[PDB]
Design a protein around this ligand. Structure first.
Ligand SMILES: Nc1ncnc2c1ncn2[C@@H]1O[C@H](COP(=O)(O)OP(=O)(O)O)[C@@H](O)[C@H]1O
Ligand SMILES: Nc1ncnc2c1ncn2[C@@H]1O[C@H](COP(=O)(O)OP(=O)(O)O)[C@@H](O)[C@H]1O
Lengths: 419, 216, 456, 65
């Protein structure tokens, strides 16, 4: 959720940054280049191309990544995993990369039917059904909130004629929200009491749907379908037959797949055998787009004995688009803070809004944020319900920055490791 | 096809429209792809009754109820052909309110899927439907869907054409749509269209008024 | 886009809005022999200036209207009307122009509004036809101007029905437009404009208050429905609506009452806040409708609602005493009301009974709210008032005008209760009166029984 | 990315954290060297020490005199 606020690159139609759209601060040149890349994508020119972000650490360039993910579409799949996360004990590297890719592709699987859901005593005015339309009015049945004034659908009679008088009525009877009902495609029905069997003690729970309807996808990722079809390390025959399954699904037009975008960071964690997979993987039929982010300089490629910029093999480097920009200033950081502040739903004095940035701007964005909640708890303690400098600085008793965290504690180390 | 030939339509064809009522029953069994064939049959059939169609008008009414059901259960291209055929008649303009529910089926189509298929139909359907039907209220509803298609939906010549049918409605809605704006390629096209009537004569009108007064 | 350039223009036209026009009006008045040249000249002049045309029309219309109101549109009045009509027709076409046109249209209507005022001889009819076209092509905002339309609605309702109902059909469509969709495309709430439409609904209630067509009823219902179920709250319109509700409910099929009932419970809370803003209207209305049912004595479900409303009357009285209160004033009001209702059959019954109802309510609650020997002062007079209720009604009630004993019972009960909760305090002259009146009535056994029991 | 604890008396605190989070919760301390075992391999001991650290509060009903 460290990027919930993000909504996209935030530029005009002429590829110019309105500097605050979508909730992204400053960082002009980066967003601009990212927009150019967005274009490149929308014309398939990124075929046999990828883009690498030469970031500065302690900043998590993921921001612009998520932004591009948004600006591509509403729900374009987007996964971000760490380069080091491929050396598992269980999964092979191939297994891991394949899982990532099949986790970067989605589908469109919607369907149709009609039946209500709800919970009320089995004395129903909709136990009969007039037909298509409201047939209820300001009908008032028992829910846990209040009575209702609403409209209903068509097929409500038979099911309640099917509904026997049960001890426990989370069954298709009525609606009592207050506003609106209908049938909808539920088919998620049985005859059952309104409770389950709990761990410590056992009590009753008055519950139940108010309504129910969905033209469903609710399963959208190539990787999702797989664990759907495994236990509640994946057998290939499952995958290919799933791929075989969808292979026709798409033909009818019933199903539609979209590319996504995948984001690795710390690419220098990989090795040649990993890259060799990618530049073969990417040139496939409909592979998603790829973005990478490092903060190392000239470096030895892992798995060999050679230097190369960022530790990337030349062949891959030639076919790349390199983007990079600056660490933050002050002004932005405050603005950056506010965003996360309001996202974290915290009462911060603009007085605090100085003592804190002067920490982060000196130390790092991704750490200062990491403190934000850590003050609310003493605000919960001091009853203060608001954060001036009063708190983080007070709990700067228990607070200190990265050099302080890393280095001065590395100096806490360098204190004693001297002996 | 015989009816198309015998299109002269004797009482044989009157009862062929009764056979089309039997074909409506054929359709019921859902006749599968054969109901699309039956739809064609009925289309012709419809074509006959064009003479008087009072009983036939009601024959068709019953039939149309069923037809509506057919294309609502949603029997694709079937519906397209049917729709047009149906339309070619008269007299329902409430049947088209049910057809507005069919255009409701026409939305969510956001793709870009395989071809203009369904859309083409709708596109085609539009002005034709618009010519008669004239639930202008739902004209606006329809228009919403139309607009989208027109904007960006692969087949632009169809959307444009669909919009041209909508253009014929010549609406406050027409001008509203125009004003509303779009990818504008098509909007400009339609806006340009966005005229066609002729009048004036700030003298002729006056004369007419005078004449009227005199008459009074 | 490019219509901002045009809106600037529309604004200007409005803003700016004349030799031609003057000439035209004057000459129109003075045309009586031969003048077509002048006529067409004028036309072209005030064609280039739609605003001018409209304005001219309006003023002319007004003067014309007064003089011609004195009649059923003979000769020149008719001429004028027709001229206007023709012009409009032509221009309506010509002037598929701006929103200057829109507001000018509003003005025109408004004159047409006044034309209808007495409904002329059809001039208004043709103006309505123009509107029908007009509104039929409108899809515009001009909310306020929509109000002139309000005037028009009223006008048509006063002139039989027919094409004004079609204009209702037009107006029905217009109401749909009030709660519509151009702004839906834009995308928002309003809420505030729902309340704007609730004011209109005040105008729709006036349409109801005229006569004919179930459309209004439907509308009302919908409006109210919409209005709540969300959670929306802001006061004055609610105060209004009620009045209207009451009115139509009285008028027929008591659906108004149902609406009102729901509203009322809600408002008892909601109107606790609304009485902070003085649900003065609410109070009066409440009383009115309470009595309306009370006259009917009791409309079951509505009556059931009203038994609960007797309880809610008490509830809201804890607030209507803030509106108006205490022993002295209570009694005064009661007496006045009594006299009034006595001197007034059904509605006088209503007045007096309302008071009692209020009075009776008050009585049991005031057994609960207070005094002992100071109570007596009012008590005897309360008893007196109770006796006086029967004095003013009872047999008066027994002939025509429609209330009930219920009150009697109520009062008795409350008093009894408090009193007994102690024991015997304080009865006295109030009690004297009580026994007397009890006896007086002796109808029927129920009440008599009650009396005796209370006494003992 | 940080630094920290030298010398003595750390695990005391781990066990402290153990007691306060309710009584009798799982606490299985292990050293990093465990995984480099020749008999069994890593994943084994890893999952083992995990399911060492999972508490089940089994509530049972007994027929008592
Ligand atoms: N709203 C935000 N939330 C979190 N991080 C942000 C936000 N805005 C900017 N950043 C961080 O600021 C950093 C900027 O680093 P920069 O030097 O611009 O990288 P590069 O040189 O590759 O352009 C990025 O890592 C990004 O994560
Ligand atoms: N103020 C204090 N009160 C009680 N015990 C303390 C206090 N300060 C330090 N300690 C002790 O520090 C000790 C840590 O030493 P030890 O038990 O050997 O743990 P470890 O070997 O993991 O460092 C704990 O036994 C704890 O009792």
């Amino acid at each position: 959720g460290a990027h919930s606020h993000i909504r996209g690159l935030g530029l005009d139609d002429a590829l110019e940054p309105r500097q605050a759209s979508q909730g992204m601060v400053g960082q002009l040149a980066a967003r601009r280049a990212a927009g150019v890349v967005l274009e490149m994508i929308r014309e398939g020119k990124i075929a046999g191309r990828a883009v690498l972000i030469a970031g500065q650490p302690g900043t998590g360039k993921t921001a612009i990544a998520m932004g591009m993910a948004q600006a591509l579409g509403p729900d374009t799949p987007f996964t971000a995993i760490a380069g080091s996360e491929i050396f598992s004990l269980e999964m092979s590297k191939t297994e891991a990369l394949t899982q990532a890719f099949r986790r970067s592709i989605g589908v469109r699987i919607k369907e149709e039917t009609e039946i209500i859901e709800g919970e009320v005593v089995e004395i129903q005015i909709d136990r009969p059904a007039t037909g298509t339309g409201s047939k209820v009015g300001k009908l008032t049945l028992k829910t846990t909130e209040m009575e209702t004034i609403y409209d209903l659908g068509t097929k409500m009679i038979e099911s309640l004629t099917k509904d026997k008088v049960q001890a426990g009525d989370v069954i298709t009877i009525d609606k009592a929200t207050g506003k609106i009902s209908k049938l909808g495609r539920s088919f998620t029905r049985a005859r059952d009491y309104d409770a389950m069997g709990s761990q410590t003690k056992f009590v009753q729970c008055p519950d139940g749907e108010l309504q129910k309807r969905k033209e469903v996808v609710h399963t959208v990722s190539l990787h999702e379908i797989d664990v759907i079809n495994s236990r509640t390390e994946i057998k290939s025959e499952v995958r290919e037959q799933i791929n075989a399954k969808v292979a026709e699904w798409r033909e009818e037009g019933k199903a539609e797949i979209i590319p996504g975008v995948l984001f690795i960071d710390e690419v220098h964690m990989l090795d040649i055998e990993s890259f060799s997979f990618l530049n073969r993987a990417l040139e496939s039929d409909m592979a998603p787009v790829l973005i990478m982010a490092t903060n190392r300089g000239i470096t030895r490629i892992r798995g060999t004995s050679y230097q190369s910029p960022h530790g990337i093999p030349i062949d891959l480097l030639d076919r790349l688009l390199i983007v990079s920009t600056t660490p933050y200033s002050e002004k932005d950081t405050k603005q950056i803070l506010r965003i996360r502040c309001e996202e974290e739903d915290v009462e911060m004095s603009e007085d605090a809004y100085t003592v804190l940035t002067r920490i982060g701007l000196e130390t790092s964005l991704r750490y200062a944020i990491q403190l934000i909640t850590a003050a609310s708890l003493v605000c919960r303690k001091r009853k203060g319900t608001e954060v001036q400098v009063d708190d983080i600085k007070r709990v700067y008793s228990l607070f200190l920055d990265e050099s302080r965290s890393t280095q001065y504690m590395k100096e806490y180390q360098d204190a004693f490791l001297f002996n | 096809x015989x009816x198309x030939x015998x299109x002269x339509x004797x009482x044989x064809x009157x009862x062929x429209x009764x056979x089309x009522x039997x074909x409506x029953x054929x359709x019921x069994x859902x006749x599968x792809x054969x109901x699309x064939x039956x739809x064609x049959x009925x289309x012709x059939x419809x074509x006959x009754x064009x003479x008087x169609x009072x009983x036939x008008x009601x024959x068709x009414x019953x039939x149309x109820x069923x037809x509506x059901x057919x294309x609502x259960x949603x029997x694709x291209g079937x519906x397209x052909x049917x729709x047009x055929x149906x339309x070619x008649x008269x007299x329902x303009x409430x049947x088209x309110x049910x057809x507005x529910x069919x255009x409701x089926x026409x939305x969510x189509x956001x793709x870009x899927x395989x071809x203009x298929x369904x859309x083409x139909x709708x596109x085609x359907x539009x002005x034709x439907x618009x010519x008669x039907x004239x639930x202008x209220x739902x004209x606006x509803x329809x228009x919403x869907x139309x607009x989208x298609x027109x904007x960006x939906x692969x087949x632009x010549x169809x959307x444009x054409x669909x919009x041209x049918x909508x253009x014929x409605x010549x609406x406050x809605x027409x001008x509203x749509x125009x004003x509303x704006x779009x990818x504008x390629x098509x909007x400009x096209x339609x806006x340009x269209x966005x005229x066609x009537x002729x009048x004036x004569x700030x003298x002729x009108x006056x004369x007419x008024x005078x004449x009227x007064x005199x008459x009074x | 886009x490019x219509x901002x350039x045009x809106x600037x223009x529309x604004x200007x036209x409005x803003x700016x809005x004349x030799x031609x026009x003057x000439x035209x009006x004057x000459x129109x008045x003075x045309x009586x022999x031969x003048x077509x040249x002048x006529x067409x000249x004028x036309x072209x002049x005030x064609x280039x200036x739609x605003x001018x045309x409209x304005x001219x029309x309006x003023x002319x219309x007004x003067x014309x209207x007064x003089x011609x109101x004195x009649x059923x549109x003979x000769x020149x009045x008719x001429x004028x009307x027709x001229x206007x009509x023709x012009x409009x027709x032509x221009x309506x076409x010509x002037x598929x122009x701006x929103x200057x046109x829109x507001x000018x249209x509003x003005x025109x209507x408004x004159x047409x509004x006044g034309x209808g005022x007495x409904x002329x001889x059809x001039x208004x009819x043709x103006x309505x036809x123009x509107x029908x076209x007009x509104x039929x092509x409108x899809x515009x905002x001009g909310x306020x101007x929509x109000x002139x339309x309000x005037x028009x609605x009223x006008x048509x309702x006063x002139x039989x029905x027919x094409x004004x109902x079609x204009x209702x059909x037009x107006x029905x469509x217009x109401x749909x437009x009030x709660x519509x969709x151009x702004x839906x495309x834009x995308x928002x709430x309003x809420x505030x404009x729902x309340x704007x439409x609730x004011x209109x609904x005040x105008x729709x209630x006036x349409x109801x208050x005229x006569x004919x067509x179930x459309x209004x009823x439907x509308x009302x219902x919908x409006x109210x429905x919409x209005x709540x179920x969300x959670x929306x709250x802001x006061x004055x319109x609610x105060x209004x609506x009620x009045x209207x509700x009451x009115x139509x409910x009285x008028x027929x099929x008591x659906x108004x009452x149902x609406x009102x009932x729901x509203x009322x419970x809600x408002x008892x809370x909601x109107x606790x806040x609304x009485x902070x803003x003085x649900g003065x209207x609410x109070x009066x209305x409440x009383x009115x409708x309470x009595x309306x049912x009370x006259x009917x004595x009791x409309x079951x479900x509505x009556x059931x609602x009203x038994x609960x409303x007797x309880x809610x009357x008490x509830x809201x009285x804890x607030x209507x005493x803030x509106x108006x209160x205490x022993x002295x004033x209570x009694x005064x009001x009661x007496x006045x009301x009594x006299x009034x209702x006595x001197x007034x059959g059904x509605x006088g019954x209503x007045x007096x009974x309302x008071x009692x109802x209020x009075x009776x309510x008050x009585x049991x609650x005031x057994x609960x709210x207070x005094x002992x020997x100071x109570x007596x002062x009012x008590x005897x007079x309360x008893x007196x008032x109770x006796x006086x209720x029967x004095x003013x009604x009872x047999x008066x009630x027994x002939x025509x005008x429609x209330x009930x004993x219920x009150x009697x019972x109520x009062x008795x009960x409350x008093x009894x209760x408090x009193x007994x909760x102690x024991x015997x305090x304080x009865x006295x002259x109030x009690x004297x009166x009580x026994x007397x009146x009890x006896x007086x009535x002796x109808x029927x056994x129920x009440x008599x029984x009650x009396x005796x029991x209370x006494x003992x | 990315l940080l630094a920290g604890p030298p010398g003595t008396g750390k695990t005391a605190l781990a066990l402290a954290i153990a007691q306060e989070l309710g009584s009798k919760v799982p606490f299985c301390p292990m050293v990093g060297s465990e995984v480099y075992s020749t008999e069994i391999k890593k994943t084994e001991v890893l999952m083992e020490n995990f399911r060492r650290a999972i508490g089940l509060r089994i509530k049972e009903t007994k027929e008592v005199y």
